[PDB]
Design a protein around this ligand. Sequence first.
Ligand SMILES: [Ca+2]
Ligand SMILES: [Cl-]
Ligand SMILES: [Cl-]
Ligand SMILES: [Mg+2]
Length: 237
Amino acid sequence: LLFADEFDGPAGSPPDPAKWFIVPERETIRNPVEWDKPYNMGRYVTDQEHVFHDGNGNLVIRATRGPGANIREKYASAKIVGLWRGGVGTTWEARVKLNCLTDGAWPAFWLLNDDPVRGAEIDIFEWYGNRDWPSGATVHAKLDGTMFQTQNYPVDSAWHTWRMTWLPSGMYFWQDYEPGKEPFFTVLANSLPEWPFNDPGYTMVPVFNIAVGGSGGREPAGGSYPADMIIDWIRVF
Ligand SMILES: [Ca+2]
Ligand SMILES: [Cl-]
Ligand SMILES: [Cl-]
Ligand SMILES: [Mg+2]
């Protein structure tokens, strides 16, 4: 293995701080439409009521609802960014249970390079609590949203593994991989006019999060909170 977290820490402890950066505040969206204004976007926090080992071998990311005047005040959740960069040829896999498929919630497992001119994003799974957009996987060859391929794919609350293999030829995605299983999504490198993933030394980091509100989650009032993402492990080889 090149990188792994088996999430086997003690109950109530933070994710390993040598492996995970816990994002300390929700992003401020540039030129926001109404759903993306700060008051309509749940907070990200770093405390162990929102991201913590369960002592049973998992990490939990939890979105909560409490008192407040708007979505920002009422809702808090977390986002973790891996402190390890992987490049071409790598196989990324995580075992996850989504107990957070509810109104307003917006869970994802994704890879990121946030370089402002050559960055890119690979969404391995994404589900939208906005009662509108379909769940699925996406390869963004640019961060401005203008050059991507996507595949709708159902996301339910059962335990699954999710795999993305990054090859010179393309990105290949599975749910519950075993030898011989067909990928649910393939994005060939020759299918977009830019492919930063084949630049010399290009690397990406893994991210897990549950966002609340924003364009992807919209109204959380009807949802069931607390809303949990349970992560047994992530492994890269
Ligand atoms: Ca584990
Ligand atoms: Cl286990
Ligand atoms: Cl990055
Ligand atoms: Mg619609």
